[PDB]
A and B are shown apart, each in its own frame.
Chain A
């Protein structure tokens, strides 16, 4: 029996364009270019999940370095002192304390200095 592909092809193309909504020009209008754009978007989403973890760790590390250098110690000596004082506290959380509650971060600084000493 003969099958016509109109409904199914329409549904597939509409799905791909709806994923491709928001792109510039033919990447959101033309189906071929939109399909090439969506696949690259998925690849970028994968690779940028991994890079999101990397970049957020880097940002926290820079903030800890800045706060510790205001407090009078380098980042590396601060971490070495923290590990000698045997705390398993996250760099994300230390960055949060460094932004919001300065006094607790200072307290961690003299604890790190005491563990180094």
Chain B
């Protein structure tokens, strides 16, 4: 018999919410990547988005180990010549930390339309309040 494939219109996508106070950034990102990709579901297919929607609360209270609070430098390029930009971990926690979580998870995720869709399912909030209480999100323990 043919191997089962999950149907993208019949797949059930649940809403999980995770508090990120004091958790390790990399290990939290690996766990969230597994959940968004759907590697925790027995009906996994690599070509169909089967994961879950995740809310991340208190993205500004993630912890990193060692000198990473000041030595971990994020680089990006503006496209114009000479336009390299650096931003350390502490200054982007100061500015906007949902990008720290999003950059980590986007790095863990695959590349293409499917990985972009899983990242779209990811929701990250900097504070301790989310607007998605109408979906009855259930708490996940990392």
Contact = CB atoms under 8 A, between A and B. Distances in A.
Does a CB–CB distance below 8 Å link A and B in the complex? yes
Contact of B42 (A56, A67, A92): A67
Interface residues of A, number: 17
Mostly helix, strand, loop or mixed at chain B's interface? Answer: loop
A96 interface: yes
Interface in B22-55: 39-46
A73 to B, nearest CB: 13
Contact of A92 (B3, B41, B46): B3
Mostly helix, strand, loop or mixed at chain A's interface? Answer: helix
A59 B40 contact: no
A95 B1 CA distance: 12
Contacts of B4: 95-96, 99-100
B42 A96 contact: no
Interface of A: 56, 59-60, 62-63, 65-67, 69-70, 92, 95-96, 98-100, 102
Interface of B: 1, 3-4, 39-46
CB-based closest 3 A-B pairs: A67-B42, A98-B42, A99-B4
13 contacts: A59-B44, A59-B45, A60-B3, A62-B39, A62-B44, A63-B42, A66-B41, A70-B42, A95-B4, A96-B1, A99-B4, A99-B42, A102-B42
